[PDB]
Enzyme design. Structure first.
Site, PDB file in Angstrom:
ATOM      1  CG  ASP A  34      87.686  84.944  14.228  1.00 51.03           C
ATOM      2  OD1 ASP A  34      87.285  86.207  13.831  1.00 51.03           O
ATOM      3  OD2 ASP A  34      86.825  84.516  14.761  1.00 51.03           O
ATOM      4  CG  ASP A 219      85.387  89.789  12.870  1.00 57.69           C
ATOM      5  OD1 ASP A 219      86.166  89.192  12.472  1.00 57.69           O
ATOM      6  OD2 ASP A 219      84.169  89.464  13.062  1.00 57.69           O
TER       7      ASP A 219
HETATM    8  C1  LIG Z   1      80.410  87.019   9.665  1.00 58.32           C
HETATM    9  O1  LIG Z   1      80.280  85.591   9.406  1.00 58.32           O
HETATM   10  C2  LIG Z   1      81.463  85.162   9.358  1.00 58.32           C
HETATM   11  C3  LIG Z   1      82.038  84.214   8.278  1.00 58.32           C
HETATM   12  C4  LIG Z   1      82.123  84.734  10.719  1.00 58.32           C
HETATM   13  O2  LIG Z   1      81.191  84.390  11.564  1.00 58.32           O
HETATM   14  N1  LIG Z   1      83.245  84.948  11.165  1.00 58.32           N
HETATM   15  C5  LIG Z   1      83.633  84.461  12.620  1.00 58.32           C
HETATM   16  C6  LIG Z   1      84.945  83.480  12.132  1.00 58.32           C
HETATM   17  C7  LIG Z   1      84.608  82.310  11.509  1.00 58.32           C
HETATM   18  C8  LIG Z   1      83.748  81.537  11.776  1.00 58.32           C
HETATM   19  C9  LIG Z   1      83.075  80.470  11.000  1.00 58.32           C
HETATM   20  C10 LIG Z   1      83.631  80.400   9.769  1.00 58.32           C
HETATM   21  C11 LIG Z   1      84.860  81.232   9.488  1.00 58.32           C
HETATM   22  C12 LIG Z   1      85.180  82.232   9.742  1.00 58.32           C
HETATM   23  O3  LIG Z   1      85.070  80.624   8.144  1.00 58.32           O
HETATM   24  C13 LIG Z   1      83.839  79.754   7.784  1.00 58.32           C
HETATM   25  O4  LIG Z   1      83.505  79.250   9.063  1.00 58.32           O
HETATM   26  C14 LIG Z   1      83.768  85.635  13.410  1.00 58.32           C
HETATM   27  O5  LIG Z   1      84.373  85.271  14.672  1.00 58.32           O
HETATM   28  C15 LIG Z   1      82.885  86.613  13.686  1.00 58.32           C
HETATM   29  N2  LIG Z   1      83.254  87.633  14.766  1.00 58.32           N
HETATM   30  C16 LIG Z   1      81.927  88.202  15.241  1.00 58.32           C
HETATM   31  C17 LIG Z   1      81.236  89.280  14.268  1.00 58.32           C
HETATM   32  C18 LIG Z   1      79.819  89.337  14.941  1.00 58.32           C
HETATM   33  C19 LIG Z   1      79.283  90.263  13.919  1.00 58.32           C
HETATM   34  C20 LIG Z   1      79.210  91.470  14.902  1.00 58.32           C
HETATM   35  C21 LIG Z   1      79.786  90.287  15.977  1.00 58.32           C
HETATM   36  O6  LIG Z   1      79.053  88.211  15.223  1.00 58.32           O
HETATM   37  C22 LIG Z   1      79.393  87.249  15.906  1.00 58.32           C
HETATM   38  N3  LIG Z   1      79.041  86.178  16.555  1.00 58.32           N
HETATM   39  C23 LIG Z   1      79.568  85.452  17.460  1.00 58.32           C
HETATM   40  C24 LIG Z   1      80.764  85.371  17.651  1.00 58.32           C
HETATM   41  C25 LIG Z   1      81.457  84.076  18.353  1.00 58.32           C
HETATM   42  C26 LIG Z   1      81.418  84.412  19.960  1.00 58.32           C
HETATM   43  C27 LIG Z   1      80.101  84.956  20.346  1.00 58.32           C
HETATM   44  C28 LIG Z   1      81.525  83.300  20.855  1.00 58.32           C
HETATM   45  C29 LIG Z   1      82.696  85.475  20.407  1.00 58.32           C
HETATM   46  C30 LIG Z   1      81.660  86.073  17.012  1.00 58.32           C
HETATM   47  C31 LIG Z   1      81.141  87.339  15.907  1.00 58.32           C
END
Ligand SMILES: CO[C@H](C)C(=O)N[C@@H](Cc1ccc2c(c1)OCO2)[C@H](O)CN[C@H]1CC2(CCC2)Oc2ncc(CC(C)(C)C)cc21
EC number: 3.4.23.46
Length: 367
Positions: A34, A219
């Site tokens: 990730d 991402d």
């Molecule tokens: C857009 O939604 C997808 C599924 C998702 O949330 N993906 C996760 C990684 C992830 C997270 C959870 C999962 C997964 C993958 O597989 C199923 O369960 C990824 O880290 C998201 N990356 C940004 C992506 C964004 C969208 C713009 C920034 O939102 C985010 N919000 C919070 C975080 C975590 C922290 C605040 C601690 C940094 C990150 C993000």
């Protein structure tokens, strides 16, 4: 770097994972890769949907940090207990590091029923680490403690799915033509600046500031090409008009309905081009994706893999699957090249082209 080729597996819409070991003796886990977060976290309890989990009691090298941690993604949260232990990537470099590990003791919508991974490897920067930027991300630890170069690259190939994570280097057999680099605007997420968007070689004529409102990121933990509220509507309006020959419901463009064909008109769907800020004043380059990248197979009832956003442009797997992507942490930049594995027909092909002349590229960054 052939030791590391094809070391990624996954299922569509479910993310990519790499095999890792934790503790002594080594405990094997599959770990979601990730670039959109910065915590290393693994299941530590027998959740019914988990194939396996981190058993701290079994590890002589385990050390408690006596701190709780809470991490919510867009959808899905987990809570955990911080610690350190010895970490390896079997099909990665031949090294072992002491790293921070969030032992997940409770989650919610995180672990997917039927998925084959047990944790998540946050590869972005400390500034967005939880609870705060003093919790050193795995990759930072790896670089500090070994001679592994501060660089990794991802070839996501795309209901099984495969790819490669090359740690510490570049493998020229994974891309064709040349790498083009865009600056990392700031080291938190992998932030970049989009300067121009063309649907079917045609400008959207929007202020470029609104392609990066309120940011643009690379991402690998996100499946979709996600476009900000204003630009999505403009983008889809252009994609609607490009594809007038057939009609689809309003819900389809919002990712509320599947659209079905018999084993499908790729033509009548336009290529999408993002122009990215280059390394040089007034110099940009463009990356171009086919609809096989933004039309997600899930009859063949594909999904529309482009969606609106409150949080900025997210260049998810939709974008990354067209390209070999170099996260050059050493020189604060990200490289893009045509992947040797991207899904293409014979009519159109994914492209990375330059140089172009674009003026006032800095004005595209939101403040
Ligand atoms: C857009 O939604 C997808 C599924 C998702 O949330 N993906 C996760 C990684 C992830 C997270 C959870 C999962 C997964 C993958 O597989 C199923 O369960 C990824 O880290 C998201 N990356 C940004 C992506 C964004 C969208 C713009 C920034 O939102 C985010 N919000 C919070 C975080 C975590 C922290 C605040 C601690 C940094 C990150 C993000």
């Amino acid at each position: 770097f052939v030791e590391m080729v094809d070391n990624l597996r996954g299922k569509s819409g479910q993310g990519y994972y790499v095999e890792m070991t934790v503790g002594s003796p080594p405990q094997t886990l599959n770990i979601l890769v990730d670039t959109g977060s910065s915590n290393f976290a693994v299941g530590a309890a027998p959740h019914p949907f988990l194939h396996r989990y981190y058993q701290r009691q079994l590890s002589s090298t385990y050390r408690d940090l006596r701190k709780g941690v809470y991490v919510p993604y867009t959808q899905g949260k987990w809570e955990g207990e911080l610690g350190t232990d010895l970490v390896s990537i079997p099909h990665g470099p031949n090294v072992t590091v002491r790293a921070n590990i969030a032992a997940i003791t409770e989650s919610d919508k995180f672990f997917i029923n039927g998925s084959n991974w047990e944790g998540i490897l946050g590869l972005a920067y400390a500034e967005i680490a939880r609870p705060d930027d003093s919790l050193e991300p795995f990759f930072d630890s790896l670089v500090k403690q070994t001679h592994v170069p501060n660089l990794f690259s991802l070839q996501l190939c795309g209901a099984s799915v495969g790819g490669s994570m090359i740690i510490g280097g570049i493998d020229h057999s994974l891309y064709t033509g040349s790498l083009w680099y865009t600056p990392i605007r700031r080291e938190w997420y992998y932030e970049v600046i989009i300067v121009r968007v063309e649907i079917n070689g045609q400008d959207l004529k929007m202020d470029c500031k609104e392609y990066n409102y309120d940011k643009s990121i690379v991402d690998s933990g996100t499946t979709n090409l996600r476009l900000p509220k204003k630009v999505f509507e403009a983008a889809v309006k252009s994609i609607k008009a490009a594809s007038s020959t057939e009609k689809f419901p309003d819900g389809f463009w919002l990712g509320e309905q599947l659209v079905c064909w018999q084993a499908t008109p790729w033509n009548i769907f336009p290529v999408i081009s993002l122009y990215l800020m280059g390394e040089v004043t007034n110099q940009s380059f463009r990356i171009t994706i086919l609809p096989q990248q933004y039309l997600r197979p899930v009859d063949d009832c594909y999904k529309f893999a482009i969606s609106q956003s409150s949080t900025g442009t997210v260049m998810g797997a939709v974008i990354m699957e067209g390209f070999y992507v170099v996260f050059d942490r050493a020189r604060k930049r990200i490289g893009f090249a045509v992947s040797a594995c991207h899904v293409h027909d014979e009519f159109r092909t994914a492209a990375v082209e330059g140089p172009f002349v674009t003026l006032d590229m800095e004005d595209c960054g939101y403040n």
